[PDB]
Design a protein around this ligand. Structure first.
Ligand code: UDP
Ligand code: U5P
Ligand code: FE
Ligand code: FE
Ligand code: ZN
Ligand code: ZN
Lengths: 340, 329
């Protein structure tokens, strides 16, 4: 009859990557089948005062602590790979460094369980590290991989920061696409997007005075979110103190809604994408963070991005709109902090 | 201090996707009474499987695409735009043996699987431009039912991977006047460093730009556009190459090796597709052992794929084991 994206399969475009996502909204459904940590761990290599696998001892830190990855995948003095135009087998040089960021000394407190003051210190540390690395490397990538579903055997809450001498794949593509949009539209892509989402609200999950978190229109993972500042901001280092303290609040609310969804510590991979330190005019950029969680149906039922998804294109069953509604239905106060 | 790809991190380019990969080299019964895919059993839907022999193909009971979905409104919005999507999905049971995976089947049985892939591709290609034959194997890929099977999806459009591969192959052919993967197959044949399986008409290698630890690319030595174009000799040899490749993967850690695999051939879009070269990709998640796997998360989802073992080391490791399944030895 008449197309209704709530009922009919369709593909949605991702303007940041130039790819499409296949949405299948009313898939036939299968038959109903039916329905604590210590604050300090003596063996934890990330805990304060402990010795790392390498022998280096961690200080008796009280807030965040950043150290160079003992097993860094990149190094700052790597020799250059030879120049090649080989259409089939070619390589390029790679230099960088990697650092681990302990969010706090408490071995059992994840982001939504930390206070706004503690979260503000984390943002302060992300800014300091990004400013320092940006002086030498054009691309700085702050990220966090959380949970065993993501491959983490050590639950100590922490993130990582990688610096690259080149623009990795996602960055170069987001940079190009954003540039094109800006050249034609004269406004940054994501700033216009924030405006549209604020007028709509159907995909909104968290809204604070300076931040907006939505399940993007083009979301690929079930409960994936995109966190963006409401004003035009190029890098994390450019946030005003007010935007910074507010970011800590948005993060706390966003991560608490994720943990309340299934009443469990929700795994995900998250990272910040900001203008590169390449000396160019980067007005086309908009600082933003992506959150990519694997869980789909329960604290134990996850989405496996395989087969058809790896050979052709990502496919999803729950729409971005339904996912946002589910995230808005729970509380924004972490279950462990609320007396419920 | 000379640049040494064996010691120094570096990036390698993937000509099929136009993306770089970062390398840091310094870093069960035959019949199950409850199985929905078993011969003579009933499915969720109450439909009953025939006592099939060989392969068995049926329309997926929970298909994500339908053939008659109404079209979506045309739109050129640069931010929020959708497009129509039609198609179908079918499940392909490899054999009635609930416990025999690809490496454990006879070359004759595998040849029947290839013939089915060809029949299903020809049939669906009359209506759809893209036909995707694939296989998701193992609990690590989310497979609850170990009954060996694959799936076949048809789309009214070219999915992301197909679109990109078609365009990059087309560009290369315009400039070189030769198909990208035909050239690549000839170069690897002459090298050997990344070769894992070589038969009369096929070659399987750990591609130079491999992203997953023991990922392989299986290609015909001659220029072939689609699976439906293989001669009978090529088809029978394909069965043997598949038995050898999959046998090597299972012998690596001596366990049923999980992977997701799929064929990419020229689309049925009525154009000149001489630029294409039929190929299959094998993307296995295991890395160090039968339990220790590779997670493509964090840095990789936010920037680019990273690998610790080089393509040359992974190929050397696959070449070191026997190509006869450990249970047939
Ligand atoms: O009655 C049925 C049962 C299953 N399937 C499909 O067949 C495959 C396997 O189903 P099963 O429960 O055996 O394993 P699972 O899909 O859950 O790993 C999947 O493609 C299902 O979508 C189907 O089409 N009809
Ligand atoms: O003594 C140690 C232990 C771990 N790590 C690093 O911290 C992260 C911890 O995560 P994982 O490997 O425990 O999963 C990794 O990137 C790892 O290399 C160190 O740098 N030093
Ligand atoms: Fe981004
Ligand atoms: Fe391909
Ligand atoms: Zn700890
Ligand atoms: Zn079975």
């Amino acid at each position: 009859t008449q197309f209704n994206p709530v009922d009919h399969p369709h593909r949605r475009y991702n303007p940041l990557t130039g790819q499409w996502i296949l949405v299948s909204p009313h898939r036939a459904k299968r038959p109903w089948e039916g329905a604590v940590l210590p604050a300090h761990d003596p063996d934890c290599f990330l805990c304060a005062g402990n010795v790392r696998v390498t022998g280096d001892k961690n200080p008796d830190y009280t807030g965040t602590y950043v150290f160079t990855n003992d097993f860094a995948a990149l190094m700052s003095d790597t020799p250059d790979a030879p120049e090649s135009h080989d259409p089939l087998m070619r390589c390029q040089s790679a230099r960088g460094t990697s650092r681990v960021i302990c969010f706090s000394p408490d071995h059992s407190k994840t982001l939504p369980e930390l206070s706004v003051a503690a979260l503000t210190e984390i943002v302060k540390t992300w800014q300091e590290q990004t400013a320092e690395l940006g002086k030498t490397y054009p691309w700085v990538q702050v990220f966090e991989n959380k949970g065993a579903a993501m491959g983490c055997s050590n639950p100590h809450p922490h993130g990582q920061i990688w610096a690259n001498s080149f623009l990795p794949n996602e960055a170069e593509r987001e940079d190009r696409l954003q540039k094109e949009y800006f050249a034609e539209q004269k406004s940054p892509m994501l700033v216009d997007y924030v405006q549209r989402e604020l007028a709509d609200g159907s995909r909104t999950v968290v809204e604070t005075e300076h931040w907006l978190a939505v399940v993007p229109y083009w979301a690929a993972w079930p409960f994936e979110t995109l966190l963006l500042p409401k004003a035009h901001v190029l890098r994390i280092t450019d946030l005003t103190d007010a935007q910074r303290s507010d970011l800590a609040l948005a993060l706390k609310k966003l991560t608490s809604r994720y943990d309340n969804l299934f009443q469990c510590s929700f795994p995900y991979s998250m990272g910040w994408h900001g203008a590169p330190f390449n000396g160019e005019e980067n007005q086309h950029w908009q600082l933003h963070a992506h959150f990519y969680p694997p869980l789909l149906r329960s604290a134990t039922v996850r989405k496996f991005m395989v087969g058809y998804e790896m050979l052709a294109e990502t496919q999803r069953d729950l729409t971005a709109e339904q996912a946002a509604e589910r995230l808005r239905a729970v509380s924004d106060i972490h279950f462990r902090e609320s007396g419920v």
